[PDB]
Symmetry: D2
Subunit: 244 residues, 4 copies
């Protein structure tokens, strides 16, 4: 509650402390696969979500304290066709009872089913969007991007990101509550490249007192499929008290 820190360097099949929604699963080799894979090939129209079992406490209505946190993970996106990719994944905080919305949720990364932004969603996400289509995703920019989503698919702030096929990406997301700042960074040590972005968000009005952290991913047409994988994931959060 006040403080919560965990680290998962490797995953196991049917992991107990992870709640899976959709078709997400963990392979025998120990890699967390949000999209089902048959004989080394990704499938089409596959949506997956994983969450940590324990809800995370963000703020208190009585005292007014608000939590600042930081997390880091390693993920891989590998597509048979480098030219075009489908949708992508995201790291998101949602209500504990959040479930997959009904209907077509591919272009929304399995988080929403409507393009409009509503304050009732109470979802705060950092998306790694690899699909820059204009007809299906008019809101997204022309290039592959890393964006911050607050109660809507239309990201308040995005940064151009150069995706590498079969490349391990080390991502870090840090929220500073006193400064009301969300920072997302991604690093490719294979080419030694960095992409960073920051935004101004206040979790008091957006998210409830208790939330759940996790990952989401989606896929589209069979021709433009891809594989999303997570190898490690570390999280730490503390609820500092304000006497003011």
């Amino acid at each position: 509650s006040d403080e919560l820190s965990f680290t998962i360097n490797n995953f196991v099949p049917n992991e107990a402390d992870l709640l899976f929604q959709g078709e997400a699963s963990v392979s025998s080799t120990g890699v967390l696969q949000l999209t089902r894979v048959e004989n080394g090939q990704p499938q089409q129209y596959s949506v997956g979500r994983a969450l940590y079992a324990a809800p995370v406490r963000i703020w208190d209505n009585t005292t007014g304290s608000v939590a600042s946190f930081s997390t880091s993970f390693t993920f891989v996106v590998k597509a048979p066709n480098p030219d075009i990719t489908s949708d992508g994944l995201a790291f998101y905080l949602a209500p504990p009872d959040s479930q997959i919305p009904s209907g077509s949720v591919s272009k929304y990364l399995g988080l929403f089913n409507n393009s409009n932004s509503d304050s009732s969603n109470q979802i705060v996400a950092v998306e790694f969007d690899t699909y820059f289509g204009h007809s299906y995703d008019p809101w997204d920019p022309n290039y592959r991007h890393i964006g911050i989503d607050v109660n809507g698919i239309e990201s308040i702030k995005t940064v151009q990101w150069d995706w590498i096929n079969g490349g391990v990406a080390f991502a870090t997301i840090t929220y500073l509550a006193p400064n009301k700042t969300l920072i997302a960074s991604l690093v490719y040590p294979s080419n030694q490249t960095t992409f960073s972005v920051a935004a101004s968000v206040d979790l008091k009005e957006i998210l409830p007192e208790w939330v759940r952290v996790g990952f989401s991913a989606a896929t589209g047409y069979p021709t433009e499929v891809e594989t999303h994988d997570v190898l490690s994931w570390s999280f730490t959060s503390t609820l500092e008290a304000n006497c003011d």
Copy 2:
């Protein structure tokens, strides 16, 4: 999984990260009450259990790694009648799907319903037994005690403990896996007294790979009731890898 640490200095009503079984609840003042209390008075035949939402990983069958951990909490036992008290409470590790056994479970601290020890229980507990009755609890010693229970109410090792009515007790439980040692200590800073005990247990054969940690408490006849309360609770565990 590999590492998990949390700290709860204060509790809130309907806490999300705590699973309650029986009649356990959290008061408005922020104290975790395993036994229901009416207008400042404990009730009779009340059994309560609380667990952490996230299961804890102890060991791996493939690598052979085993986790060592440590936890600390503060609890209060306050009875209207200091002469005689009912049952008591315990800090226990059990399977994630553990539920309250049917039948009379008061004298067993809400963990078992049979006096015999069976390896299928897979429950490892540290009990603070305040009831020294001989007819109902022939297994327990003549004095109030702190005991270690492994797959049975009959504690493998117990230490005499002087209970103080309305006294805050600071307890610490530490498991060292390489040495296969479980250590339980209790401190009263109001009188500056300490009671410690150690035992030899191996969680490989007893508990499964994934377990849940928490507290349990029970009460008996109305004349000899008592109030069990928990004010704070901190836990930390790491899964160190063995290359041997």
Copy 3:
């Protein structure tokens, strides 16, 4: 040794756990001032260095283990004249017995006194260079930059950085040893801007087994002076063992 973590949210005068070289000092208000300030005005030709008292263990020659670490701090650079600024500061790892080189060390940020790179220096730094002069600093680029220095002032990799006068900057430096990667990030939450850079370095050949971490800063001519301040600083490092 194996693990070391500390956090200093506020500083105190004549702090015991900080070793000061040059004219660095801590103000009564609790801000770490590397450059001496008279009545709210910075001085000229002022060089300061601060280090943590405890040396940090990086690697072992026998086992071959190498440490990965992460640190974060907050710093402020405030100059009376926004047009031109002097030198700058840096976060550096050096030998425990490192001292200020003799001679003009202003343009070298108080770390070196020669422009050439020599492997005997054994200094690894992340510099926030605010002086883009060409005659005095031909090696530096045309713009204010954040650079990574390995045994020389000429940074192996630099990133353009927009300096803000009187603006609080939150910086984070993370070294991953298995991937041999050094990452430096800087954030301005007042304007919500981020600047990140990564480089490939191996501390085995560069630094010795035991090093000291800290900060350095320098100033130049009186007309182009500036004030360097540090408000908070957190560091954490672990020495993970490799069984390969």
Copy 4:
């Protein structure tokens, strides 16, 4: 300062982050030896002290905040003659500039040189005293003990302790500042035995704002020598802020 945590599972020769006073040293095998050992035999009249390089912040005079901390370590005491042992060792907090007092400091575990208690010492120690002599140590009880020392060799509180020759002991010392309580526990997993003690101390009046943590050990006559060794040592302290005073 506000928070400081470190862990040393193994030691190395000439360790940089440890300050050694006296004849303490680290062996090639990686064990911290406070008393010099020749060819596997302890020596006589050997006094050693080790401290962590970084001073530890306990309290602030302005805000009034006071730090609570916890530490754990593993130590071995092995004597050729189990019948009688010399002096012992202790885990102590002292001023950063503390040095070995001049004169005979064997019976005082290398911390003091006078039996009387003076508030100017500013030393807070947890001693594992293995010498129960009455003529040389009239203050100590009749049995081997674990004691808490505050500005004096005469321990305010002691607990009987059964020493095991060549036995690994796991010790844990925890200070709770809001409750002003110091707790010391020792465990032998080889026989599964525990010895615990608690005392009431306030570091505000005793120790200064900045202190240094470490270990001390001493030896006596050649016939009753022993070897003191430390295998691992972990420390963690945090300075929690109190808004009641402010």
